[PDB]
Amino acid sequence: MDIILGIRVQDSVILASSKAVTRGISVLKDSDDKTRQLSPHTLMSFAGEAGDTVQFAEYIQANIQLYSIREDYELSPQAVSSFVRQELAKSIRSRRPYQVNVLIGGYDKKKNKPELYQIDYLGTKVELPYGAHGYSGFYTFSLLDHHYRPDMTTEEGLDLLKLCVQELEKRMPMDFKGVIVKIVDKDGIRQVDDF
């Protein structure tokens, strides 16, 4: 799929992901949620080749949920991101690799810190204050470089995120049919229904 964004603020992680699904000439759907909840305080958005994206996201989801049941314990965002990276790093030298780029936004309940991880299909992990995949970064990073602070509130983060989406809507050729925004904080994961 097309545009996925992430921004880590003071006390939460915010993930924006486009709603459009284009199969060639037509936009088949304009309300697609390009994300999966891996655990109560860990959310992974994704974008890449069709099929591979969901297949991968659900495979990861199942594995983390299996871990959660076995140990009766939620893995840290760092731990989940490392697991995910290894799966992609394993994948890239396979017969047919997973062609999937992901953002992992999680709130670490132990350290009481939000954490955003950006991992591409090669298995290239980086912890960031704000991240993106594909052409999304080319437009947004210049805005985020300017306006971003580590002590921003969630409402300030959403406003900065709106400014990013507006710039994408102005300068990107593809109509991505807006974004679904989700917030990950100490209280868990919720969706901003109006954006």
Binding site: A89, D120, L122, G123, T124, V126
Partner: protein
């Protein structure tokens, strides 16, 4: 396309009098796009330091792999691995992937705890050992680093002088490379103390 220059980055290592220095830039990119300015390429296992340039996923993978192997080494041997031995381990590990190699340019640096002798070594992506006396270079600005090191370097430099030499070798090489820069780190290594210094450089 070329795996060794997608993410970009550089590592350089030098020997001094009773000391070694290893240094790297902090850039990680997706070709033209700069992604991270905190991607450190120098890792350490005990007193043995390893810098890794090249494809970032493999940089990470190999660090995790040599951490894995040096930890088991320590449990069985009941002692920390030495630079000479680690160099051989790196070469072995890389060559076993001869026809499906990790796209990396590793650089070992450290001081032998028993003999006190300063040691550096470089490798190609499939495990060939380049055990130089003077200096080792690696990464997308290796040509530039070769040019800097070959002119700036002199033997038997004191730690605080060696720092200036390696720092200037890295900085000026990185500035003539599009895929390197965005910060830099220099490790000054002595027999029983290690100082790590972040350099202030142009952020373009």
């Amino acid at each position: 396309s070329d795996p060794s220059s997608i993410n970009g980055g550089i590592v350089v290592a030098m020997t001094g009098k009773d000391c070694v220095a290893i240094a790297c830039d902090l850039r990680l990119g997706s070709q033209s796009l700069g992604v991270s300015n905190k991607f450190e390429k120098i890792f350490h296992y005990g007193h043995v330091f390893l810098g890794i340039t090249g494809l970032a996923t493999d940089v990470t993978t190999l660090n995790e792999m040599f951490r894995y192997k040096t930890n088991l080494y320590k449990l069985k041997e009941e002692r920390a691995i030495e630079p000479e031995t680690f160099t051989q381990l790196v070469s072995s590990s890389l060559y076993e992937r001869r026809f499906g190699p990790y796209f990396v340019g590793p650089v070992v640096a450290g001081i032998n705890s028993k003999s006190g002798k300063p040691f550096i070594a470089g490798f190609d992506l499939i495990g060939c050992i380049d055990e130089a006396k003077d200096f080792i270079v690696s990464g997308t600005a290796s040509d530039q680093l070769f040019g800097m090191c070959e002119s700036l370097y002199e033997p038997n430099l004191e730690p605080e002088d060696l720092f200036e030499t390696i720092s200037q070798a890295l900085l000026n090489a990185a500035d003539r490379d599009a895929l390197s820069g965005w910060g830099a780190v220099v490790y000054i290594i002595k027999k029983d103390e290690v100082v790590k210094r972040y350099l202030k450089m142009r952020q373009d």
